[PDB]
Symmetry: C3
Subunit: 73 residues, 3 copies
């Protein structure tokens, strides 16, 4: 399934069973943002390592928001 990540916006190709760490790797692969500067938000919660996308009920064409941990908080 496709999900969107807005900081501009990128598309990721993901599966519900993917982890947050694994989503961050993909954002790196595409965007060059190191995983350890990424804060991901979905539906107003910051996502945490360990979980999967279905733990947050993230679904097709869900929109995530990336905030840089630098400064941005």
């Amino acid at each position: 399934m496709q999900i969107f990540v807005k900081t501009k916006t990128i598309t990721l190709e993901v599966e519900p069973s993917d982890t947050i760490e694994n989503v961050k790797a993909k954002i790196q692969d595409k965007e060059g943002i190191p995983p350890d500067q990424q804060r991901l938000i979905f539906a107003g919660k910051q996502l945490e390592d360990g979980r999967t996308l279905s733990d947050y009920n993230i679904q097709k064409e869900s929109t995530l928001h990336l905030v840089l941990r630098l400064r941005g908080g």
Copy 2:
């Protein structure tokens, strides 16, 4: 309208002010760089692109500022 930021300063703000505009005003009064400000209201950490009224922050609401470097 007046709001309070406790770590306690007063700010003069408009419902339509953005969070980053609030942190700049904090900076101009306190010298704390926006990039080190964590603003909490009603148990939630505020995020840049929102406005005070997206959080129903109102006259004499009290926000809490934590420094990012202090952790939490």
Copy 3:
């Protein structure tokens, strides 16, 4: 009371009236992780310094999660 902190789990010996800074000092005393690098989660909420354990309804055998600030949310 006993509570557990998972990142490796440690047991701390704490009172409900203890503060989050004090808990974090105890983690430091046992793990050497400095408190300004500790991010404590319980029941889905990041804990904040001005509160006590009872403000979070933390109790005997509650499980907290430590995330390092080196992340990445």
